Point group: C5
Chain length 359, copies 5
């Protein structure tokens, strides 16, 4: 019983199998269970709001036809070069750019057929998928990125898509992302589509990504803090009269503006204010207030110069103010900073915890 | 009544359907109604003057042929692999670069045919479209971007394009742009094309985009203002004789030139002057005038040095000028700035309001 | 008289039309008139010396065959899917990179055939074309960019290319370039090609582009001038003894070097010296000479310090020199700058005027 | 005995050779030996974690069919245009992006067939392969990059992949990399794949790459060291009272922050701390501690100013501290730096030596 | 004698011409002479070590078949659409990335056939070719870039490649490169390839490129020199006691480090030290030594301060040293620089002259 004779006999010009007609025509819709395996996730672009994923799509549906029932083995592994002579369902991705196939030495495709007629179609695909991420809290956030699968040409009374009950979404073992930590929530929902042409089936899968704060802390939170420390200690424990104290402030402001521009470099332009903007704005406000304080001290010194020639009675009165302000500044500034840091870190921790619970 | 027999019978070698001849040949022009659905707008490049759009083109026309009239159901959903055996009309985009199709698991295409002969052709297309935007007012403006559809090979007495009376342009729900706000004007006009070869049909669609000022305000209007504030308060409330006061001005000018270069970084080179250029030029003029004022004060001080050895009569005469100028400067500069800001913001608000009314 | 029968009958297996043999074989060369319409010019890259153009090529030639002479209408608009069964001439572009076609909903192609046999072939093409621009005068210049069309496979006694007598080159109405102004010279020449294999026909078209000076003036000529003004007025109207005067020069030099590097940023590396290099070099020379002058003043002051303890006789002798140099510098520097600006702007104006007359 | 007759006769419609059925069907799995030749390795991207390689894949397997046994010469070199009429095995790369073929003048392919039936299939391929490199030790490290080959459609009882016993991996003579030194370990392992669909064969090859420290040393280790040297010697051998000493520190800090940002520029964002970060952090700590020391000296000087009007008894007591600290600083700082450098270089040398031994 | 009948008759199903069998089968190897014309060289990337070239490949070989010998004209220009029905030889480029063809309006291809059977095959190709350039001497060097042509599928007793005796390599008239000057050496060698599969023919062509020093001199050699001049003259002709003199050095060092980083920006990372690195290192050493000298002068001044209250006997002794060092520095530094420049320019001139003679 040669393989070739049977092979053609099933889907040949002698067989009545038309590949342009859906199975069970004029009948109940063809149910399709979809299984996805993630081979290599990664390369998430924050600029143009998209990520790259290489999946192994797997879809099964039941055909009354192609149930040979005359062979010792129930499952037959067929050629992937005769995949044009069967009824593949139409499937497209809604948030999709590009999405090439792969042709290395052979087409990366798979066909299997059981005795009853259940088929197994497996396709390797790299997808560039659009994720409209919300950057309300930039360094610490959970981002949800969407994969949607729809039928382009078939209305709801044909080709209903369903998920797989067990192991709908899998991940390759030892798969890591440099920037994000993937979570195991693996949310799945059915989100039907309505158009003027008709109503079309859809199923979607949701992934939760948390952002590591390790890079961001080292890159920005540490340098900005160190420059605040530098300004604080450096000028106040210097003599009242000096060009250096003044110059220090200007240079510190220059560093702050360069770092502020540097932070908002990779990020796409957005209307709302991110957390990192709040932090850098507060640090800039601290150094600006510090330079203003020194300018005020200089004015008090100017008053002393005018007084110098009941002369000494006024002199000390102003000078003592000079000293009092200088000491209060020394003890006042760090405590206020400490207070800011605590009420900032606490609230952000509460927001991120609430966000993960909400999602 | 098997599907295959009829299916071929309509558009087969036994049928007299030639796909190279227009329907109703030697007759009135084939009218075509066009419906467009916008799946995902975005990614607008200001440099090379273009934007990206992913649409769902839909065009309907009437064929006397293909009106079977022998089936229980009026509408038949046919295969998208037999779309080469019918009379699709020619259609191209005038301001177009690229414009690939999509081939993911199947071609993303749709064919429908009613009992009378009205067809429905639906195509998924990503377009890179050229928009010749006018940057007269850079941060606040309304930009109109053009989509034009034309018949390449058919003159006006064939294949007249028309718009759809109801729901000509739709937008996918919850579609947002990071940089712009789309408006609901959805202007539609017919803009016929004349060539030496002949006169060709065209229809166009206009989109109005407003620019959010949230990013621009934070990125440039706030830092420049803060550096003006810094210069103003810092030097004048310092003693007349100091190297610091001089140095401050030079560094402030350095910041202004770097920010001015930074502003005109993404923008393409254009002859006309943008609003942001006016703002940065005025701020640069303020700090330049401030440094000139300090230089003049130094010259008055030089006069005092020459006088120092009717000697004291001249001395005070110049010194009082020194004081008078210093105080007037303190009160003079902010009010003039305030006046500038009001007459700048008011006029730009009037221009943008006029522009939206005009469009 | 059905369309299909005739349609095939002309260029069918029953017709003796071989599409691999040139018309009028063993005869006079096939003359071809070429008409070009420019749909969208632009995107000129100065780095890799090329520009992008989207044209509508149109070529006409006479075929003795395909002159049916039996139809009421002289001109027939045929399908663009049967363009493989005729004798298209070979045509390629010599300074060409890439040059894709366009396939949106249909091929963008056109076929027309008259009663005598004159055909009309219209093709939409985007060309990346190499322009070896000469940057001798960078901000103000006229650049000539070349389009060449040649026959790859046919020697001069076949397929002679000719231009069209009227309307050889057209431009779409309201077509503008952000950087350049297109001129209406529209030069056309025939520039035959000689090879060892044979002698091949060619025709070329020349476009003249002038550069707007509006962006360049604002970006570089104004900031550099303002920094020269700043240095000039700032240090000389300050007291002889100061750290500030010295520091000012160094910072001004830093600005000059950064701007000089910034100017030569987009530009490709070239051996010859551009006009902008001359301007920035002269401005750098002015500030360098200014700092040297201050250093000399300091040395004269050093002489006074040595003299201070016929002592006063020497003292004033040197001091008066100090004053004399300071005043002459004040009046000397701007006039010399003014002279430089006039003899620079005048000569460049003469060169550009001569260049346009020459071209 | 004409070539054509035999040529077709072997794999023709008269032959029973079906190219869709595996050789030795219903039998032991088809064993495949794989030989790889590396034509041009290189272009390793640290950002998106991948490298480029151009290989010569070679795979041999035994076919009972195609053993003609009637020719004088055992080995026949066949055409590479009839490679569609045989049973090529499926093969794909797991960590693969892209992987085009090459079509220059002909397809770059090879077919050979021996008398017994052993075939030789040779394919030229450029692979972009994903390497998840570990940057724990950035300048000095050994990186292992993975190539994996798998059967997409065939389970373990078909198409078992095996390596070649002799010369499995070769390298073209005189092949060098600008950044890395390739090692000759050439590790080979079999790393079978398990899926829910089935169990699939795989074989992998490991390459060891060491990083040259020549560029990194010159680019970063030398400038940072020179700036530490500059700060150290420059300020301490200057008078106690000066604006210059203060300013020096701020500028040195500015250089350190710019260099620190410059170092972490090419590198992708990662949570863990690299060796270069440790080095730059320690150098920044040294200059920060130096500026703090100067600030403390200024405070001691302030005490002297307060004392100046048992007055002189206190004065010297503080002044001597000033001198003592200044001298100890002079001798203290370099030795501590020397100690740091030795314990840093030694430990990194031990870690890299351990790593190469482990791998 | 119609063209079509003969045309097919030569290479038709009635002719015994099999296009899968080499001419003169079981015979001496098919000799192939190769002629290359360079249409447009250029776009040489120093980063990823490659260049772009657009060539006109021409190869001739002798076929016993296709020698009609019955026509008045010896040479026939055939269609380039029947190039699939002949025996083209296999040819690939070893150092090749990409290498597309060109399809503009027609395939850019040529076929000619003489009476004896000598064919002429002409192909237009753009090649991206890998050149492993040696950057030992960066601004002045001669670089040799390699083109290699090999037979992928045929061993040495078939398809031997040979060069053309006259005019093997040509260049289009008036072809210029912005960065390099092409030389006329046009070296040609045969460099056979050995593999385990077999021994394969190869022929190679060598191009010599010299680098213009005009851009590099202006961009780096002039600014660095000017900044050395600035430092030299500026500080030494200033009073011994000043904050300005100190600050000058730090700023000059900042310029040197920025320029040094700027130089090594386009260049790929390499272990060895380039000439430009030597030059910038020496200039940095000069300014570093200058600042150290000023620091030493300050220490001598400190000694004078300690002495000031046999007191005056010590005072002058140190002061005279101060003066002596200051003058020697003034005359010492430029001569040493002059010596460096001469022994640097001379040796590099000798090395480049030796290199061109060697090549
Ligand atoms: C597909 O699913 C629908 C709804 O679950 C059901 O009504 C229909 O019978 C199913 N089709 C089958 C089992 O063929
Ligand atoms: C198409 O529209 C034109 C103008 O509206 C009309 O004259 C013509 O009859 C229409 N064709 C039809 C209805 O087939
Ligand atoms: C084509 O032009 C040439 C030169 O103008 C002429 O000799 C020849 O007769 C022309 N061919 C025609 C008119 O068919
Ligand atoms: C292939 O290898 C397996 C295991 O080494 C062996 O059992 C089998 O017989 C081999 N197949 C052959 C030699 O055809
Ligand atoms: C090709 O060249 C080889 C060596 O030069 C020679 O032996 C052989 O006869 C040549 N083949 C011909 C002339 O057909």
């Amino acid at each position: 019983m040669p393989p070739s004779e049977f092979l053609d006999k099933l889907m040949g010009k002698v067989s009545g199998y038309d590949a342009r007609i859906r199975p069970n025509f004029k009948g109940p819709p063809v149910n399709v269970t979809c299984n996805i395996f993630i081979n290599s996730f990664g390369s998430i672009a924050e600029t143009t709001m998209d990520y790259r994923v290489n999946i192994f799509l797997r879809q099964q549906w039941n055909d009354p036809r192609l149930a040979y029932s005359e062979y010792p083995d129930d499952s037959l592994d067929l050629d992937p070069s005769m995949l044009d002579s069967i009824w593949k369902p139409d499937l497209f991705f809604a948030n999709e750019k590009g999405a090439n196939f792969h042709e290395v030495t052979t087409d990366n495709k798979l066909l299997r057929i059981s005795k009853n007629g259940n088929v197994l179609y497996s396709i390797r695909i790299t997808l560039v998928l659009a994720c409209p991420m919300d950057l309300k809290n930039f360094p610490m956030d959970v981002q949800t990125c969407i994969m949607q699968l729809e039928s382009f040409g078939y209305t709801m009374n044909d080709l209903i898509f369903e998920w797989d009950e067990k192991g709908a979404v899998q991940v390759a073992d030892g798969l890591t992302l440099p920037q994000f930590i993937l979570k195991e929530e693996k949310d799945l929902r059915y989100c039907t589509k309505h158009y003027n042409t008709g109503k079309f089936t859809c199923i979607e899968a949701r992934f939760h990504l948390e952002r590591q704060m390790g890079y961001y802390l080292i890159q920005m939170y540490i340098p900005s803090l160190l420059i605040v420390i530098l300004s604080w200690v450096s000028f106040w424990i210097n003599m009242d009269a000096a060009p250096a104290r003044v110059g220090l402030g200007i240079t510190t402001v220059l560093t702050m503006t360069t770092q502020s521009s540097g932070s908002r470099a990779s990020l796409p332009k957005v209307s709302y204010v991110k957390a990192i903007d709040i932090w850098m704005a507060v640090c800039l406000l601290f150094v600006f207030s510090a330079l203003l304080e020194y300018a005020a001290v200089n004015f008090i010194a100017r008053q002393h110069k005018e007084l110098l020639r009941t002369v000494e009675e006024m002199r000390k009165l102003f000078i003592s103010r000079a000293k009092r302000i200088d000491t209060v500044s020394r003890v006042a500034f760090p405590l206020v900073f400490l207070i800011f840091n605590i009420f900032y870190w606490i609230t952000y921790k509460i927001i991120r915890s609430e966000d993960i619970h909400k999602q």
